Design an enzyme around this catalytic site. Structure first.
Site, mmCIF file in Angstrom:
data_model
loop_
_atom_site.group_PDB
_atom_site.id
_atom_site.type_symbol
_atom_site.label_atom_id
_atom_site.label_comp_id
_atom_site.label_asym_id
_atom_site.label_seq_id
_atom_site.Cartn_x
_atom_site.Cartn_y
_atom_site.Cartn_z
ATOM 1 N N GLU A 80 5.358 -5.792 0.397
ATOM 2 C CA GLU A 80 4.643 -4.623 -0.085
ATOM 3 C C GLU A 80 5.327 -3.337 0.348
ATOM 4 O O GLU A 80 4.669 -2.343 0.685
ATOM 5 C CB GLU A 80 3.163 -4.622 0.361
ATOM 6 C CG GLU A 80 2.419 -5.927 0.156
ATOM 7 C CD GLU A 80 0.992 -5.879 0.589
ATOM 8 O OE1 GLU A 80 0.471 -4.802 0.909
ATOM 9 O OE2 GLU A 80 0.355 -6.989 0.583
ATOM 10 N N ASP A 88 6.821 0.065 1.052
ATOM 11 C CA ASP A 88 6.795 1.463 0.690
ATOM 12 C C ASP A 88 7.077 2.226 1.985
ATOM 13 O O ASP A 88 6.875 1.718 3.084
ATOM 14 C CB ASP A 88 5.530 1.877 -0.071
ATOM 15 C CG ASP A 88 4.218 1.481 0.564
ATOM 16 O OD1 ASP A 88 4.133 1.401 1.806
ATOM 17 O OD2 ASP A 88 3.225 1.300 -0.190
ATOM 18 N N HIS A 118 4.692 -1.609 5.091
ATOM 19 C CA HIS A 118 4.185 -0.284 4.797
ATOM 20 C C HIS A 118 4.584 0.656 5.930
ATOM 21 O O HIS A 118 3.849 0.885 6.894
ATOM 22 C CB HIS A 118 2.672 -0.293 4.663
ATOM 23 C CG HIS A 118 2.204 -1.040 3.464
ATOM 24 N ND1 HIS A 118 2.455 -0.609 2.181
ATOM 25 C CD2 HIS A 118 1.503 -2.200 3.340
ATOM 26 C CE1 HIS A 118 1.958 -1.484 1.320
ATOM 27 N NE2 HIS A 118 1.347 -2.444 1.985
ATOM 28 N N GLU A 156 -3.791 -10.542 6.566
ATOM 29 C CA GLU A 156 -4.339 -9.561 7.533
ATOM 30 C C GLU A 156 -5.308 -10.142 8.545
ATOM 31 O O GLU A 156 -6.350 -9.552 8.829
ATOM 32 C CB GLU A 156 -4.950 -8.369 6.813
ATOM 33 C CG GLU A 156 -3.959 -7.586 5.957
ATOM 34 C CD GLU A 156 -4.482 -6.349 5.331
ATOM 35 O OE1 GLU A 156 -5.713 -6.117 5.379
ATOM 36 O OE2 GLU A 156 -3.636 -5.588 4.809
ATOM 37 N N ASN A 167 0.537 -13.314 5.245
ATOM 38 C CA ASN A 167 0.967 -11.930 4.979
ATOM 39 C C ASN A 167 0.225 -10.984 5.905
ATOM 40 O O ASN A 167 -0.985 -11.122 6.148
ATOM 41 C CB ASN A 167 0.624 -11.606 3.511
ATOM 42 C CG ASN A 167 1.253 -10.333 2.963
ATOM 43 O OD1 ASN A 167 2.487 -10.214 3.016
ATOM 44 N ND2 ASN A 167 0.443 -9.459 2.399
#
Ligand SMILES: O[C@@H]1[C@@H](O)[C@H](O[C@@H]2CNC[C@H](O)[C@H]2O)OC[C@H]1O
Length: 302
Positions: A236, A238, A207, A128, A170
């Site tokens: 990750e 979702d 995400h 990030e 990431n």
């Protein structure tokens, strides 16, 4: 064809993973479904900076090792998450800046990676580092304020600490090829490759939600990063509302890109999700399969 996500992914040499939380490892439904379905594990929190180094120089791998050991006992590999990040820093590290922070960042990388040397297929070395919005700037943090080179230093440190690990960068909101943030990350990885900075992989958190929706151009993003000489991973995943069609689309984008290592979803049941109100995962609260599960499995099975 195979009957579980990990096995279906493995037919093409890929994995299908989840995030595992140590606090859930006494839940028999959780452990049995996760055990059955996934062949890759990320610790949801236990390998972060605060959890592993709660005081400077004083490591605590108890929760991390619980997750790691559960994974290997259940036949999964492990993605290490995450070594250098603005978030979930322990207080002692929040108080550091400049050269002192740089030393602490390096020491943290070295200590955690040594503990797992040779045991971790991929590390999210840096997480990030870009700002959201149109600028493509770096996110403000103590780490960034220490110098633009913080990220490269973290990677060089990691390469030396465990030459066997794939080193990943990431981030989120970097899936849509047209977004500025995606382009900032692209330019970084390209620059790193051109200057010899060791980076092996890019993690797309994935995400997806109404404000940051999936786009078919994710496949273009994946292809273009692959063309830089890095592997790509969906780390990750979702999706708000768990629409089956979108889940199939993401899966097929990974399957279409030879350097896409696999897919991790960020939890098991909707009720395990950090965004459980968005019901964004593949299994219902009661452990039953959702429509999105079938769409993913079918995609993995061709
Ligand atoms: O338990 C949550 C955990 O799920 C969350 O995980 C992060 C999600 N955002 C991107 C990061 O890379 C993940 O580590 O972190 C906050 C915890 O409270």
């Amino acid at each position: 064809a195979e009957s579980t996500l990990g096995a279906a992914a493995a037919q093409s040499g890929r994995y299908f993973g989840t995030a595992i939380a140590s606090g859930r490892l006494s839940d028999s439904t959780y452990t049995s479904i996760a055990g059955r379905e996934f062949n890759m594990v990320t610790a949801e929190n236990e390998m972060k900076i605060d959890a592993t180094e709660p005081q400077r120089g004083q490591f605590n791998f108890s929760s991390a090792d619980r997750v790691y050991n559960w994974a290997v006992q259940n036949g999964k590999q492990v993605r290490g998450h995450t070594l250098a990040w603005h978030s979930q820093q322990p207080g002692w590290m929040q108080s550091l800046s400049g050269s002192a922070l740089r030393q602490a960042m390096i020491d943290h990388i070295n200590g955690v990676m040594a503990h797992y040397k040779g045991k971790i297929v991929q590390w999210d070395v840096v997480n990030e580092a870009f700002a959201d919005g149109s600028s493509g700037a770096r996110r403000d943090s103590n780490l960034q304020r220490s110098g633009n080179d913080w990220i490269e230093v973290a990677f060089r440190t990691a390469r030396a600490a465990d030459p066997s690990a794939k080193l990943c960068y990431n981030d989120y909101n970097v899936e849509n090829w047209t977004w500025a943030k995606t382009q900032a990350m692209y330019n970084m990885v390209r620059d790193f490759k051109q200057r010899g900075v060791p980076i092996d992989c890019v993690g797309f958190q994935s995400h997806f939600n109404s404000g940051s929706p999936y786009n078919s151009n994710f496949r273009t993003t994946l292809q273009n990063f692959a063309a830089l000489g890095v592997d790509v991973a969906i780390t990750e995943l979702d999706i708000q509302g768990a629409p089956a069609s979108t889940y199939a689309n993401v899966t097929n984008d990974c399957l279409a890109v030879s350097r896409c290592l696999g897919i991790t979803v960020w939890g098991v049941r909707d009720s395990d999700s950090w965004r459980s109100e968005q019901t964004p995962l593949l299994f219902n609260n009661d452990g039953s399969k959702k429509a999105a599960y079938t769409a993913v499995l079918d995609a993995l099975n061709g």
